[PDB]
Each structure stands twice: as C-alpha cells, then as structure tokens.
Amino acid sequence: NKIALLHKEAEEKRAMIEAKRGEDLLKAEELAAKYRATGTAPKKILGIF
C-alpha cells in the first residue's frame, strides 16, 4: 500500500537523516578526537568554540 510505501519513504528519509546523524555523531567523534588532541585554540572546551 502506497501510504505504507510513503511511510517507508519518510522512514528512509529518517534513515537518511540518521545517516547524516550517524556521521554527524562521527564528526563529533572526530571532534572528540581533535578536541582531545587539541593542537588548537579553546576548540575543545565545554562544547566547541
């Protein structure tokens, strides 16, 4: 049924968003890696800067 297909389309969007988020989280993992190994300004304190 099409609505279910579109509900799926919506959830594929979700999964696409969560793909971004899963990467964004990994970008924040990178941030965690960069910020941990600062080698930079306060770019690591209590958030990001």
**Domain locations in the chain?**
1-49
Taking the C-alpha atoms of 31, 37, 39 and 44 in order, what is their torsion angle to the nearest 10 degrees? 50
Taking the C-alpha atoms of 23, 24, 27 and 32 in order, what is their torsion angle to the nearest 10 degrees? -120
34: CB partners within 8 A, 6+ apart: 40, 43, 44
Method used for this model? NMR
- CA end-to-end span of the chain: 48
Cβ atoms of 41 and 49 within 8 Å: the answer is yes
C-alpha–C-alpha distance, residues 21 and 6, integer Å: 21
DSSP the chain: -HHHHHHHHHHHHHHHHHHHHHHHHHHHHHHHHHHHT--SSSTTSTT--
C-alpha–C-alpha distance, residues 44 and 23, integer Å: 19
Q: The tokens of 5 are what?
A: 């297909």
Which amino acid, one-letter code, is at 7? H
